[PDB]
Design a protein around this motif. Structure first.
Motif, PDB file in Angstrom:
ATOM      1  N   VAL A  55       8.375 -16.436  -8.917  1.00  0.00           N
ATOM      2  CA  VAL A  55       7.831 -15.115  -9.219  1.00  0.00           C
ATOM      3  C   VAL A  55       8.339 -14.187  -8.127  1.00  0.00           C
ATOM      4  N   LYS A  56       9.157 -13.222  -8.530  1.00  0.00           N
ATOM      5  CA  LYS A  56       9.739 -12.267  -7.600  1.00  0.00           C
ATOM      6  C   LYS A  56       9.071 -10.906  -7.647  1.00  0.00           C
ATOM      7  N   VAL A  57       8.765 -10.376  -6.470  1.00  0.00           N
ATOM      8  CA  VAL A  57       8.168  -9.058  -6.374  1.00  0.00           C
ATOM      9  C   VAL A  57       9.357  -8.112  -6.330  1.00  0.00           C
ATOM     10  N   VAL A  58       9.538  -7.337  -7.391  1.00  0.00           N
ATOM     11  CA  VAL A  58      10.650  -6.403  -7.440  1.00  0.00           C
ATOM     12  C   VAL A  58      10.176  -4.971  -7.243  1.00  0.00           C
ATOM     13  N   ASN A  59      10.894  -4.236  -6.401  1.00  0.00           N
ATOM     14  CA  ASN A  59      10.568  -2.846  -6.125  1.00  0.00           C
ATOM     15  C   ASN A  59      11.717  -1.962  -6.593  1.00  0.00           C
ATOM     16  N   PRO A  60      11.494  -1.174  -7.655  1.00  0.00           N
ATOM     17  CA  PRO A  60      12.554  -0.296  -8.155  1.00  0.00           C
ATOM     18  C   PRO A  60      12.743   0.896  -7.218  1.00  0.00           C
ATOM     19  N   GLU A  61      11.776   1.086  -6.326  1.00  0.00           N
ATOM     20  CA  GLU A  61      11.800   2.190  -5.375  1.00  0.00           C
ATOM     21  C   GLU A  61      12.607   1.879  -4.112  1.00  0.00           C
ATOM     22  N   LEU A  62      12.739   0.599  -3.776  1.00  0.00           N
ATOM     23  CA  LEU A  62      13.486   0.214  -2.583  1.00  0.00           C
ATOM     24  C   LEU A  62      14.972   0.552  -2.678  1.00  0.00           C
ATOM     25  N   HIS A  63      15.470   1.245  -1.659  1.00  0.00           N
ATOM     26  CA  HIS A  63      16.868   1.664  -1.593  1.00  0.00           C
ATOM     27  C   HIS A  63      17.848   0.490  -1.636  1.00  0.00           C
ATOM     28  N   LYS A  64      18.664   0.448  -2.688  1.00  0.00           N
ATOM     29  CA  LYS A  64      19.646  -0.622  -2.880  1.00  0.00           C
ATOM     30  C   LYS A  64      20.958  -0.453  -2.116  1.00  0.00           C
ATOM     31  N   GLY A  65      21.002   0.486  -1.177  1.00  0.00           N
ATOM     32  CA  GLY A  65      22.227   0.707  -0.427  1.00  0.00           C
ATOM     33  C   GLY A  65      22.347  -0.068   0.872  1.00  0.00           C
ATOM     34  N   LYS A  66      22.374   0.668   1.980  1.00  0.00           N
ATOM     35  CA  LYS A  66      22.493   0.086   3.314  1.00  0.00           C
ATOM     36  C   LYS A  66      21.553   0.857   4.245  1.00  0.00           C
ATOM     37  N   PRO A 118       5.912  17.675  11.810  1.00  0.00           N
ATOM     38  CA  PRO A 118       5.840  17.090  10.467  1.00  0.00           C
ATOM     39  C   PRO A 118       7.111  16.306  10.145  1.00  0.00           C
ATOM     40  N   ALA A 119       6.988  15.307   9.278  1.00  0.00           N
ATOM     41  CA  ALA A 119       8.130  14.482   8.904  1.00  0.00           C
ATOM     42  C   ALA A 119       8.152  14.219   7.402  1.00  0.00           C
ATOM     43  N   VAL A 120       9.345  13.986   6.865  1.00  0.00           N
ATOM     44  CA  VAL A 120       9.508  13.725   5.441  1.00  0.00           C
ATOM     45  C   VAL A 120      10.116  12.348   5.186  1.00  0.00           C
ATOM     46  N   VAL A 121       9.467  11.571   4.325  1.00  0.00           N
ATOM     47  CA  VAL A 121       9.956  10.244   3.976  1.00  0.00           C
ATOM     48  C   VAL A 121      11.202  10.404   3.117  1.00  0.00           C
ATOM     49  N   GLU A 122      12.324   9.865   3.581  1.00  0.00           N
ATOM     50  CA  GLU A 122      13.554   9.971   2.812  1.00  0.00           C
ATOM     51  C   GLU A 122      13.704   8.805   1.845  1.00  0.00           C
ATOM     52  N   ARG A 123      13.669   7.584   2.368  1.00  0.00           N
ATOM     53  CA  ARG A 123      13.811   6.413   1.511  1.00  0.00           C
ATOM     54  C   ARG A 123      13.203   5.150   2.099  1.00  0.00           C
ATOM     55  N   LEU A 124      12.665   4.310   1.220  1.00  0.00           N
ATOM     56  CA  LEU A 124      12.056   3.052   1.626  1.00  0.00           C
ATOM     57  C   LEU A 124      13.128   1.971   1.699  1.00  0.00           C
ATOM     58  N   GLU A 125      13.162   1.251   2.815  1.00  0.00           N
ATOM     59  CA  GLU A 125      14.132   0.181   3.004  1.00  0.00           C
ATOM     60  C   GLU A 125      13.444  -1.173   2.995  1.00  0.00           C
ATOM     61  N   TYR A 126      14.172  -2.194   2.554  1.00  0.00           N
ATOM     62  CA  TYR A 126      13.631  -3.543   2.528  1.00  0.00           C
ATOM     63  C   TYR A 126      13.787  -4.129   3.923  1.00  0.00           C
ATOM     64  N   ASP A 127      12.696  -4.642   4.481  1.00  0.00           N
ATOM     65  CA  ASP A 127      12.750  -5.230   5.810  1.00  0.00           C
ATOM     66  C   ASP A 127      12.543  -6.735   5.740  1.00  0.00           C
ATOM     67  N   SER A 157       6.600  -8.471   6.464  1.00  0.00           N
ATOM     68  CA  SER A 157       6.049  -8.656   5.131  1.00  0.00           C
ATOM     69  C   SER A 157       5.888  -7.297   4.456  1.00  0.00           C
ATOM     70  N   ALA A 158       5.861  -6.243   5.266  1.00  0.00           N
ATOM     71  CA  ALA A 158       5.729  -4.886   4.755  1.00  0.00           C
ATOM     72  C   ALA A 158       7.125  -4.289   4.605  1.00  0.00           C
ATOM     73  N   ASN A 159       7.187  -3.006   4.263  1.00  0.00           N
ATOM     74  CA  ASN A 159       8.462  -2.316   4.110  1.00  0.00           C
ATOM     75  C   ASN A 159       8.652  -1.346   5.265  1.00  0.00           C
ATOM     76  N   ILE A 160       9.819  -0.717   5.305  1.00  0.00           N
ATOM     77  CA  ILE A 160      10.126   0.250   6.345  1.00  0.00           C
ATOM     78  C   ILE A 160      10.640   1.523   5.693  1.00  0.00           C
ATOM     79  N   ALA A 161      10.107   2.660   6.126  1.00  0.00           N
ATOM     80  CA  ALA A 161      10.500   3.943   5.561  1.00  0.00           C
ATOM     81  C   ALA A 161      11.386   4.750   6.499  1.00  0.00           C
ATOM     82  N   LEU A 162      12.518   5.211   5.977  1.00  0.00           N
ATOM     83  CA  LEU A 162      13.431   6.029   6.760  1.00  0.00           C
ATOM     84  C   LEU A 162      12.810   7.417   6.772  1.00  0.00           C
ATOM     85  N   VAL A 163      12.216   7.770   7.907  1.00  0.00           N
ATOM     86  CA  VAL A 163      11.539   9.048   8.059  1.00  0.00           C
ATOM     87  C   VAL A 163      12.270  10.041   8.954  1.00  0.00           C
ATOM     88  N   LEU A 164      12.372  11.274   8.469  1.00  0.00           N
ATOM     89  CA  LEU A 164      13.037  12.350   9.190  1.00  0.00           C
ATOM     90  C   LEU A 164      12.050  13.463   9.527  1.00  0.00           C
TER      91      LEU A 164
END
Lengths: 271, 46
Positions: free
Chosen positions: A16-27, A74-83, A87-94
RNA sequence: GCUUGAGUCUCGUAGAGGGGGGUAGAAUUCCAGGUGUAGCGGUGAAAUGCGUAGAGAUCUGGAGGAAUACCGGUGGCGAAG
RNA sequence: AGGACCGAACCGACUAAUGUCGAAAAAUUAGCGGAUGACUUGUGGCUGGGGGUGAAAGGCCAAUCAAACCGGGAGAUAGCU
RNA sequence: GCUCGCCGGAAGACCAAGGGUUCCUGUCCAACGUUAAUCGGGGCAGGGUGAGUCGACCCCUAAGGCGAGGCCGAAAGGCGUAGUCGAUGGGAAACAGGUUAAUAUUCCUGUACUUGGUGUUACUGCGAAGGGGGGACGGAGAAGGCUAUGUUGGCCGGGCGACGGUUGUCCCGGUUUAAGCGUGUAGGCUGGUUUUCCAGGCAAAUCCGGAAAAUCAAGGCUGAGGCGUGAUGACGAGGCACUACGGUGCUGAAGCAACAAAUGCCCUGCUUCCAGGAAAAGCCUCUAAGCAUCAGGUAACAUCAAAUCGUACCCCAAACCGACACAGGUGGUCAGGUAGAGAAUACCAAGGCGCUUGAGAGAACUCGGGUGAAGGAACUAGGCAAAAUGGUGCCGUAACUUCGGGAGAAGGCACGCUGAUAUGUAGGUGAGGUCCCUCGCGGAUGGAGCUGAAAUCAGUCGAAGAUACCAGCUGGCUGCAACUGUUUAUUAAAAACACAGCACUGUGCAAACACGAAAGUGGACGUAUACGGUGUGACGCCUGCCCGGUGCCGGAAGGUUAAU
RNA sequence: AAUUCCUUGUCGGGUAAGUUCCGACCUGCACGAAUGGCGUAAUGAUGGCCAGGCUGUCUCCACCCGAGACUCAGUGAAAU
RNA sequence: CUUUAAUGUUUGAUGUUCUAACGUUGACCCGUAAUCCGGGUUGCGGACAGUGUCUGGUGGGUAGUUUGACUGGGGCGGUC
RNA sequence: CGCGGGGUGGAGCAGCCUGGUAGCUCGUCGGGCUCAUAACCCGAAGGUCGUCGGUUCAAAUCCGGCCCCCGCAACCA
């Protein structure tokens, strides 16, 4: 999102895989990475201290700032990265000033939201601020213990700390274990719960699903010979010894906690 | 069968080299003993 | 085609209709401190259990979970549950 | 996509036979299991004797292991041959 | 020398490692070679390894090691910072042909390339152990575009042929050409350009990032191959000429087309899934302490340097590791033709060998095999062994099931050769011709030539048409174990271990635990959906009673009770 | 029964004949629920049993082809 | 003598608080481009913690060891 | 073959250990309660202490022979 695969082969039928369509598939972001070459349980003396660790896949460490010292801006969340490490995720914040940083990924946080770090922050999940400016009975995480360490408690998937009371200079927390401890009230805690709250429901399936992660086959003591493990020996799975560790000390029932230096701050304990 | 001696001078000199022995105290005893017997080949080196 | 069937629109009315998110007080249990003393609890009676390590009783504060006193009515609402 | 299927290279080593002062101090011939993975191997360092290592047999640690090899205690000791 | 026979994804051709002259010539035969030996990896003497572009060294780092101070420890010594080493990693530069008994991308000829020093000229702000970009990246799968390379046609040279035909749709041989520069194609990626502002980058910044607007729609970067140039050159089949009979000297035509096509290149790509996939320097860019008629930097040019070591031979083996000239083991690369899906297999190519004892005989018996009337597991511990099944396409396929399977279930059918549909089709490749055009390696149209399945019918032949090598025995009842996998190297490969999953319990971070006298690491640069231990061992239906004894957790009043 | 000593237990099926196998009876010497219980598709160089095909395994061997054995020439061991 | 009362005095056992020991694997700065270490401020704990000597308990985690003889073979039973 | 224990009213168990008196529950008989039974209540009786011998003031008891019964052992090559 959780998905259960179909039995196209023996062993695949239980994954059973937890899939996140929101997680950035790049680098991931370049300047925030470093080498984290494995250890395998070895120490300076080259001896294996902790068993069942080594091998597996190679992973690059993402240096994430838990401090949240860049105050107010103030900061803006750009993209969520897979860490891979957490066990949690990491957000690229600017921020507004033009600085990129990684932080943990709270629950109800999507790409493009607005966060801030400091006592001037509004009550919004994702904001980090000192605990004396937070209403009692709140839901936070990434709680520190010293004004500057960075955050120790509630740092994995789907965990949330509940603040009970704020009596004087101390704040009574009711941790994830159930243990209640007082801490210096000037320690920053990030609001809301941490996301990636489906990590618990992930069932590996294959033996490799645990192997490429980094573990080793845990050998039971009763199979070994008495010279190796405190258990073992016999003709046909014999036992009789009270369960202990491969070093003699009793397991399945023996409180090993004995520090006394931090016993003072602890009010209640896991029952 | 796969014999128990697959020679490689790079690896051979790193272990049983002159300096490898000269590096520690235990090794320094060896150069003393070898020279004590009057052995012409003090260690493995050209 | 018509219009008394059925259906829509313009305006209001009453209701525990349904789902999501908050919040309050009483009461119970446990927990901590204080007062305080040999019974408490229970049943037809008794006993297990609780108690001189100090309960029950009483006061203060807190942590928690569920259910919503009186209003409540062969009242209202729902296709039914 | 797959610890997926058949099957070479590669890894491994179930059966039979030859061999047993062998061609060889575990191999050859004929068939065998895996063959996109917990896969395989090169190069290169780390872990050491009551310690190492171990998907655990008391197997492995230079053809030697229920405690390696070398030297020194040591001409150990022997109610034994 | 002439036949024969073997390997040919090797028993061939070259590198690394490791050996250490085994390489070549002359000469010799005591000893060495499992025999002889005028022979040789043997003895004796002599000869042989030629580098700015290959490698090493060098510049830069990983694991990891050493480690000034320092922390720690009876001493020795242990750990580790700044540093400094350490490749199997990154980083500047050469290809072709010829030659020696033996070496050659090293020597000669021809033709290019790289990095620095110095000097002149013309311009111009340069400048760090500092900052940014870059280097810089996973597995797997798919498609297109090419080349290596082969087949074939044409062309040239030679032949026209010791038993029958053979100037013919005939036979044999050749038909090879690089790096660099120029072009920048197929194709890949990214929106470019300008101005201003900025608590960010431990300082600064015109660089990078961010936020506003202006302007245009392309620009820029990258990129195999092809084509020119390289090259009226070289090489070149085969002759003409001399043979110390080993070969040398000399000359030398054709040298193009087409199709097929890789695992090589494009690809350090694209898509996709996830377990989420080195570092630093070289390189490029911006500034600081400052230095500024300087010093230096940028472009062209003249000129000089590119040092030292390695280089012979073997590298699937008589030379490495196995005591041996040992049926064993040994990383990487190139790897043709036919049949074939293929690097399997059968035979062959270039090339390399016939394995260092042979000659007779044809007894029993033994080893490696061939065939086998009648029967067919009666053998035997047991169908061990052999036998037999074995390919592609199509048809067909059960109980049961976790709904994927089961299953390639089982069980059958059609295959050769020739002609025909069609003087070889579908399909693929694709020049010439034509036109357009932001004019070139372009785009539509065009279709010859080339190449080439499968299908259907008909005819023919033998006993047999997947004719050889190659290449499943099938099914049923049932125990154990979920399954892949691992294990006693050298008698046990299994029902043992492992396994994802489940459960109890230990742990609030200077975490428990472990190594370690200690410091300090690991756990983890993780933090209770996390980590260590034990037990069981997928999934399904469940997991009943006992707290006596033992162990452990909680509560401590009393009794007992150590040092003091 | 991987567990049953007595035991080749008793009955039924399978062979002409079955101390093994299969399905059951409970009289469990001495099964049993995470030292897990009872089942289970697929998997297995696993264990036990039966049927078909097929054959020199066997009934019962025979012949043939090669390497030795044998003879000749050269060299020339070993355990005891 | 027993029961007890105020004060002084003698030490001891709890509780709370403080800052100066000590800790600090908290933040910042410097030696220094060094996340090790030391020093200086400060914040948080705090006479605890931790360490050293003595002491009781647990203690196969580890170590050196014992575990009889006679015996119509040894065990077993019996016995000395 | 050997070691340890047991045999007690009709039944199942104490008392034995440390000897002089044999108890408990159920069963049996009689009475009562109800129309009757069970159940319950009241009362009484019943034991060669397996068998024999010995020691002894005294034997169920301690010892020994034998029978019956149960557990255990009946082994390694």
């Amino acid at each position: 999102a959780v998905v259960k695969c179909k039995p196209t082969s023996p062993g695949r039928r239980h994954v059973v895989k937890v899939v996140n369509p929101e997680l950035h598939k790049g680098k991931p972001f370049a300047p925030l990475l470093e080498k984290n070459s494995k250890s395998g349980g070895r120490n300076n003396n080259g001896r294996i201290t902790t068993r069942h660790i080594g091998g597996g896949h190679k992973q690059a460490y993402r240096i994430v700032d838990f401090k949240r010292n860049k105050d107010g801006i103030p900061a803006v969340v750009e993209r969520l990265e897979y860490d891979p490490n957490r066990s949690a995720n990491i957000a690229l914040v600017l921020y507004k000033d033009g600085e990129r940083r990684y932080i943990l990924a709270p629950k109800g946080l999507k790409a493009g939201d607005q966060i801030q770090s400091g006592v001037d922050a509004a009550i919004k999940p994702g904001n980090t601020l000192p605990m004396r400016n937070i209403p009692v009975g709140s839901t936070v995480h990434n709680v520190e213990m010293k004004p500057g360490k960075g955050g120790q408690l509630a740092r994995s998937a789907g965990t949330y700390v509940q603040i009970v009371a704020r009596d004087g200079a101390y704040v009574t927390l009711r941790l994830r274990s159930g243990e209640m401890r007082k801490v210096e009230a000037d320690c920053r805690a990030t609001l809301g719960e941490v996301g990636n709250a489906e990590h618990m429901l992930r069932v590996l399936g294959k033996a490799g699903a645990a192997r490429w992660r980094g573990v080793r086959p845990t050998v039971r003591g009763t199979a070994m010979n008495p010279v190796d493990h405190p258990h073992g020996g016999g003709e046909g799975r014999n036992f009789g010894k009270h369960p202990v560790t491969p070093w003699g000390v009793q397991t399945k029932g023996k409180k090993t906690r004995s520090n006394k230096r931090t016993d003072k701050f602890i009010v209640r304990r896991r029952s | 069968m796969k014999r128990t001696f697959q020679p490689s001078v790079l690896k051979r000199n790193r272990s049983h080299g002159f300096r490898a022995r000269m590096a520690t105290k235990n090794g320094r005893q060896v150069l003393a003993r070898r020279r004590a017997k009057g052995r012409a080949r003090l260690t493995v080196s050209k």
